[PDB]
Ligand SMILES: CCCOc1ccc(S(=O)(=O)N2CCN(C)CC2)cc1-c1nc(CC)c(I)c(=O)[nH]1
């Protein structure tokens with residue numbers, strides 16, 4: 288109750304003071320407590336505390352719960368990565384102007400999903416995984432003192448819970464590759480329409496992958512640092528091939544996604560832009576072997 292006390296007691300600086308609206312945001316210099324505050328600020332400015340009557344001590348306790356159920360011993364797949372995915376969701380919603388295209392319940396679900404989508408990850412070297420992540424998510428959402436959805440009606444609740452699940456499931460890269468075909472194909476023909484339930488759900492899945500991979504879009508000194516973390520998990524847990532690997536990952540997985548995303552909303556362009564700049568940096572490196 289120590290950590291809970293001083294998080295509950297704390298005052299929560301604005302979104303601007305916290306820089307959680309910048310696509311180029313980083314957390315390297317933030318204490319855990321500070322990340323907890325940033326996360327509170329996120330729920331608040333998306334109007335989630337308002338519209339769904341969340342009690343402060345419950346939201347605080349829920350966040351500390353999510354944080355605790357990530358493992359420090361894992362280099363990349365930990366609370367910070369979860370934290371950053373949620374921040375990128377937030378920036379895409381505000382700066383990227385995606386808030387306008389989605390319902391409140393969807394937004395609530397995307398935020399929770401981003402924060403929870405890798406819960407209890409033990410490292411890439413230890414959609415099966417995603418089902419286990421959603422499980423952790425549910426268990427926490429139903430824990431006494433932690434019920435941040437209690438204010439929702441049973442209908443709202445069921446709808447939110449189903450969306451949370453699809454969102455976490457969507458972070459299986461396998462699922463992303465299988466489904467992106469239809470997404471790119473739709474946009475290609477200027478047919479993509481969010482008001483169709485089926486495409487709406489597809490977009491939420493793609494948005495999830497986009498935030499999940501947002502590290503690839505960060506300013507070069509930041510991306511280099513993060514790439515180092517994922518290298519630590521990949522190879523040590525538990526010529527240099529990495530720059531070539533990164534260029535491959537960017538080509539196969541990242542570029543088209545961020546291209547499609549900016550097509551949906553011109554203001555997500557920075558994600559695309561940061562990704563390209565990073566490809567440039569990794570390719571130069573690759574050519575020196
Ligand atoms: C940086 C050191 C090496 O890093 C990588 C190496 C290879 C590939 S991969 O496309 O071949 N592929 C993915 C599926 N699978 C796990 C097998 C490999 C991806 C990464 C990588 N992934 C992510 C997302 C977790 C980020 I964000 C990132 O910056 N880099």
Ligand SMILES: [Mg+2]
Nearest residue numbers: 404405458459
């Ligand atoms: Mg995952």
Ligand SMILES: [Zn+2]
Nearest residue numbers: 404405458499
């Ligand atoms: Zn992830």
